[PDB]
Design a protein around this ligand. Sequence first.
Ligand SMILES: Nc1nc2c(ncn2[C@H]2C[C@H](O)[C@@H](COP(=O)(O)OP(=O)(O)OP(=O)(O)O)O2)c(=O)[nH]1
Ligand SMILES: Nc1ncnc2c1ncn2[C@H]1C[C@H](O)[C@@H](COP(=O)(O)OP(=O)(O)O)O1
Ligand SMILES: [Mg+2]
Ligand SMILES: [Mg+2]
Ligand SMILES: [Mg+2]
Ligand SMILES: [Mg+2]
Lengths: 60, 556, 41
Amino acid sequence: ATGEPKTKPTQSSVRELRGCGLSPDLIVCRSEKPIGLEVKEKISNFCHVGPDQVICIHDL
Amino acid sequence: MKYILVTGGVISGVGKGVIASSFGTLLKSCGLDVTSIKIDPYINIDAGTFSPYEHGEVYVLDDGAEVDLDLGNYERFLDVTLHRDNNITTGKIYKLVIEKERTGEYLGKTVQVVPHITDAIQEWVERVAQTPVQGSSKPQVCIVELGGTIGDIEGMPFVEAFRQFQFRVKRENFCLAHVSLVPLPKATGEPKTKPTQSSVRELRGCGLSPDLIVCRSEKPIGLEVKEKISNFCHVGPDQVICIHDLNSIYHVPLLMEQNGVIEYLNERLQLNIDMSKRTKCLQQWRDLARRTETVRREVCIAVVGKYTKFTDSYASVVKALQHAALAVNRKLELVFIESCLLEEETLHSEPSKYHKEWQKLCDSHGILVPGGFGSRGMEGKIRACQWARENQKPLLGICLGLQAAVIEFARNKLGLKDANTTEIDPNTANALVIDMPEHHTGQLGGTMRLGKRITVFSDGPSVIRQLYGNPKSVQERHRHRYEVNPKYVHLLEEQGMRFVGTDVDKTRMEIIELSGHPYFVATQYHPEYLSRPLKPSPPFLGLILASVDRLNQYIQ
Amino acid sequence: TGKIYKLVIEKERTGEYLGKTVQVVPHITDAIQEWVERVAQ
Ligand SMILES: Nc1nc2c(ncn2[C@H]2C[C@H](O)[C@@H](COP(=O)(O)OP(=O)(O)OP(=O)(O)O)O2)c(=O)[nH]1
Ligand SMILES: Nc1ncnc2c1ncn2[C@H]1C[C@H](O)[C@@H](COP(=O)(O)OP(=O)(O)O)O1
Ligand SMILES: [Mg+2]
Ligand SMILES: [Mg+2]
Ligand SMILES: [Mg+2]
Ligand SMILES: [Mg+2]
């Protein structure tokens, strides 16, 4: 329906973890299908991690 | 006045717009007058400076305002003419408050968020709720949709404003439907209620409480998940509504009616709706859904566009094509074609994709070249127009498609191989499409030819004139900044083309048509913005009829 | 606050953020940090 990977739940989870006092050093993104470069860039920009700190594991 | 607030769960593509439009449809079927206010917590004044990828296709109103596609959905489902005040952004509220503070309305106290920004938001909502929108109709229910999800930094002022607003107008006049997502991952295999519980916890911490929980999934969720949501959201079993992905959005009002939403809202908001009279209320939507289910004949239209990576970037165009396909009892097979892959540069890089897209274009009954901005993909549109004109394939170009058609005609028939648009090639020997002088003041955003205009039919038999109903002039909405150049106009007209659409001044050409070719129509305005489920846009209807070789029969 | 929001709205109305959604975290905070950088120096 939406037809695109959504990064908002991960942003909210990172915000909650930081408000709890912990800043992620890696972020593992679980998806059914591989996400594009722009999705990882959005994750890095809005969850405030480097582009290489966003690990993307899909349904192997 | 009664209010329904539709908030978002974990994502912003969950379906709040469709849920709000279905609320409006259900209430207007009963007999009420429904207003719709879209709240966009972004700081942009309007949606005219948005890419189609950001949130979908940009909608243009009668007064020129460029807004979200949610307002397009509201107009399509409710058949109402919205205004600029029906969209509330953060930028609008802050600009209003800053202007008031500068003038001196707030003299004496500092201007804050909670006492001033939220007060301005509540004043805006109350004032625009009462503004007539369908004529002399005085609204009874206002459906406010909050863009985004609960928990965003931009949405905190609006959530606090509505937390105060529910007590300002009493709870009997205020309801809240929360729309959430229930993901079902393949690895886990089970619907997950945790994000909905998190959303409800956040919305309760913010001071509100969902009267309804609308759970969105791809497939119907089992009763265990629904009961878990009812248990962990402190709402009753019958206050959780499960809406899955349906074949069309005409099924959403029917599904919500089957779920007892109308009765719950009548009891919760004291709407005093009578059930005995409200029988066969949604007959139009039931008929439309049945027709969408039972269409067998196939019509294939190739959309040669540049924003095909996101399918909602052409939402209004797809809806107009669907309306035209249903108006002639045809099933619409829509094949999006990236115009970049049709260019010769793609041939030397991805020959497989080049030939695949070209055989996609050659196997369709009709071609549609939509509008757009920038120079990327323009050559693909010109190549598609050339193929359509050479092979007698019907083509309907919109805005940027008219410029591409004019450029192709000048380059091929007139021999001007350097013909181009100033938007793309400012240093052009033969500038076939030039910029309009009064829309290039260096201030992007609300500075084009926006909204309803007047287009005059030329003196001469044209089938596009007959499609509209043999009028003398028509009023259509524009969103363009560049125009066709007069002398080239003249030359081309002489050659093989007929500029059959102009304005009152008879200088700005809007509609072109070709002698010979069965259907080659290009317009400067957007016909999709005025398309309604029972009122298909005449250009799209003509394109469909020419594609299925039924235009001549429809003429007589 | 008023200065920052007025500055961002005026920038957006000209086309400095052409094509993107102007938000708080990427844009208001960037304006605040750019203000601090240009004033401190
Ligand atoms: N390029 C352009 N965009 C405008 C203009 N006026 C309003 N807008 C809007 C439409 C565009 O979607 C948005 C610009 O963002 P983008 O550059 O990402 O869209 P565009 O269609 O140009 O795609 P592209 O740049 O070729 O990748 O601003 C204009 O005069 N030129
Ligand atoms: N119940 C449903 N079944 C199938 N598709 C749906 C649906 N509800 C919405 N959609 C489609 C239509 C929209 O283009 C897209 C979501 O956009 P939307 O309805 O405007 O939601 P939002 O306002 O949250 O962005 O998904
Ligand atoms: Mg949306
Ligand atoms: Mg919406
Ligand atoms: Mg987004
Ligand atoms: Mg651009």
